[PDB]
Amino acid sequence: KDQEIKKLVDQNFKPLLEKYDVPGMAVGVIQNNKKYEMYYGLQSVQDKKAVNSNTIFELGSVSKLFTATAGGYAKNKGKISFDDTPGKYWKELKNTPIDQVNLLQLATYTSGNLALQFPDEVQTDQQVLTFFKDWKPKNPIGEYRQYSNPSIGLFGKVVALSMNKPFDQVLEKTIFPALGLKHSYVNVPKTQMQNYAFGYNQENQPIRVNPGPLDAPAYGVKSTLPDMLSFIHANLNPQKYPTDIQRAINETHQGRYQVNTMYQALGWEEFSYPATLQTLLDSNSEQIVMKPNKVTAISKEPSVKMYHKTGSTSGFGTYVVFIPKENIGLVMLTNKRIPNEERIKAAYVVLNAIK
Ligand SMILES: *[B@]([O])([C]N1[C]=C([C][N]S(=O)(=O)[C]C(F)(F)F)N=N1)OP([O])([O])=O
Structure with missing residues (x-):
């Protein structure tokens, strides 16, 4: 039966490369603690470099899972409560209409006035702080979900202040090690740049993600297929991980609304x-x-x-x-x-075919 995993992945994922002109792809399956890695095509077209277990991809919104886990870790170490408001940690947002929104509401997109993106004009730490102070409610807080990078991004920044480390060190020094990830980054270091895939736009131009306001917590993580399979393993089978991180993972699994x-x-x-x-x-x-x-x-x-x-x-x-x-x-x-x-x-x- 195990000798069917490759076949099925070939049947279902492989055709998508030709259909969408995708240069490279990594598909991982984990089943009963056993990992399967399927690599296809190129991490760099210009360099003729194959996708392999060392290939680093941008996860985009999947980064939000790491932010949430980091929140779960901080709650269970007593550093934050999901009932707190950002103003308790970002002393400056006090008494502003945002500071009636609690940490859970931000994480779960229900502030009632936050869009998918910040305005393009917002870039600096300073424009970010301004956007939030000036923020006013629209829908009754907690009532409406609108998926938003600013919403969870602020949650992210708050989780960092609570741990007295900038968001990047929270993941790289605390969260990733606890999850046993060896090649997951907010900032890909010099010695790994050769393993960092080019992304390719709809014009097949090579591109990588641009720096943006509260990007790391919202969409700024990069990882390998082995690391992501380890992350799924932790999600599936947490009881093995430090109690700290078991608690953090459990927290991300609880439905809110x-x-x-x-x-x-x-x-x-x-x-x-x-x-x-x-x-x-x-x-x-x-x-x-x-x-x-x-x-x-x-x-x-x-x-x-x-x-x-x-x-x-x-x-x-x-x-x-x-x-x-x-x-x-x-x-x-x-x-x-x-x-x-x-x-x-x-x-x-x-x-479905396997189980
Ligand atoms: B997340 O990946 C956040 N997200 C996705 C998008 C779509 N814009 S993009 O062209 O993919 C590039 C950008 F993120 F802007 F840099 N915008 N924000 O969301 P999903 O995948 O929908 O859950």
Whole structure:
């Protein structure tokens, strides 16, 4: 049966390279603590350099999972409460309309007035602080989800202040080591630059992510396929990790609210398992990703859960999914974006075929 994992990944992921002209791709499956890595094509077209276990890809919004885990770690070490407001930590946002929003609401996008992106004009630490002070409510706080890089990005920055280290050191010095990751970075160091893939835009130009305001917590992490499989392993099978980080991971798995069939946990999207294909696809629909939606309390607490998250930068696509009770998960990393629905579908066919 194990000798089917490669075949299935070949059948479902491999065709996407030709269909979308993707130079390179890494697909990982973990099943019953056993890892499978499938590499395709090139990390650099110009250099004729193959994707391999050393290839570093940009995770985009999948970084949000690390931010959430870092939040979970900080809560369980007593450094923050999800009930606190940013103003307790960012002394300067005190008494501003933002400081009626609590840390959970930010992490889970329900401030009621935050968009997918900051305005292009905002770049400096100084413009960031200004944006937040001037911020005013629109929807009743807590009531509406609009997916937002500023929302979780501020949560991210707050988690860092609470640990008295800049966000980058929180991940590189604390979170990544605890998860046993060897090649995951906020800032790819000089000795790894040769392992850093070019991303490729829709014009097949080589590109990498540009510095941006509160980028690290929102979409600024880079990682390898082995590291991401280790991250999924930790999610699937946490009891093995330091108690600190087991607690942090548990915290990211708890659903906070729903939007019909999608449960918002911390970073992760949660669903009842088995989920229909369209349930998974809907989490990534324009309605959900791009538009405000009123939430509801969790009514059905799913017995058996599965979790996913997509990620994108201008030249990179990412998807991660896991099902604890099947003890399986999948990671897809590309150095060109392909439609989210393509990622989700391919993963669905493979994980279903094995389990
Ligand atoms: B996250 O990856 C955050 N995200 C994605 C986008 C789409 N813009 S982009 O072209 O992919 C590049 C950018 F991020 F802007 F740098 N904007 N913010 O979100 P998802 O993958 O949708 O969950």
